[PDB]
Amino acid sequence: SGPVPSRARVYTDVNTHRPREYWDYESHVVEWGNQDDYQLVRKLGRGKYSEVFEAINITNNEKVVVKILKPVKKKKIKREIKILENLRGGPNIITLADIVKDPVSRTPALVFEHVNNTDFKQLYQTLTDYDIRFYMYEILKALDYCHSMGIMHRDVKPHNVMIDHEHRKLRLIDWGLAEFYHPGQEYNVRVASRYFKGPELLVDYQMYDYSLDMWSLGCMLASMIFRKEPFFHGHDNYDQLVRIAKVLGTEDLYDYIDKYNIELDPRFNDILGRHSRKRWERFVHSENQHLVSPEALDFLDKLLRYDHQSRLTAREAMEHPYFYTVVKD
């Protein structure tokens, strides 16, 4: 028997209908720039896979960001690069401006457009109900674009959303875990941050799709409107599914595993137990009430569904009543 297969409900065959070179990133040959065009100014941060710096392009004096890669398999660099090139000019996608290699240490560096980004903690503190709706709509433009272009980000989370509040301007960054969607493909589940992982990853269902990004958007929305970051605070990959089960209930979970005939790691047997599906009110308090509204909760319910096939698409989400104010403006 083994697991029941799955196809995306949308954008299913988009890569099939493209030339091979579009998605066959292992064949991509990288176009190098001149490393001497960029001088590093200061360090902005350490990532899992990179060090990130402010730099100046001495050619034109433009401010630029340089992500110096820690060692990874070349095929993964080509993948990140290919996806960035494919998505360049798309709505609210970071622009890759150049690619250089240190000619001695041989370590590669991606050069990005600069976002004058507001600090993440100071932003998830000052955001009105309207700002959230605005920025969520802006993120969904990025997700609908990338999905329509055959790509799933697989690392949606607040740290990978760069907002310049002063200019009402948003960019979805860090495409280093992104992958091409191909029907029938089994993907690695060891992706995304713990708190943003979909159930499909947690139960080891590999034949997942774009809808993964819609779960992780849900997790973001919840933490923003209920002011609880993270929203699903698991202690590990197993307890993460338990945290989810304590909110969504276990009846839907076991129906989900039954539908796709998922062999469940026996360990999970114990710790899941039996849990009712909770109502969103439990997380409403006087600190957050100004951000919680019936539309917001309707919207959130339709993202956070175990069964990836039944979650909103990006395009559907953008048509939800939560965004009727933003759409008019």
Ligand SMILES: O=C1NC(N[C@]23C[C@H]4C[C@H](C[C@H](C4)C2)C3)=N/C1=C\c1ccc2ncsc2c1
């Ligand atoms: O690919 C990237 N990866 C990361 N990763 C980090 C990881 C931590 C959180 C956040 C800021 C630092 C530390 C760098 C993203 N940044 C990246 C890109 C980037 C592009 C433009 C830009 N403009 C202002 S900040 C910024 C960052």
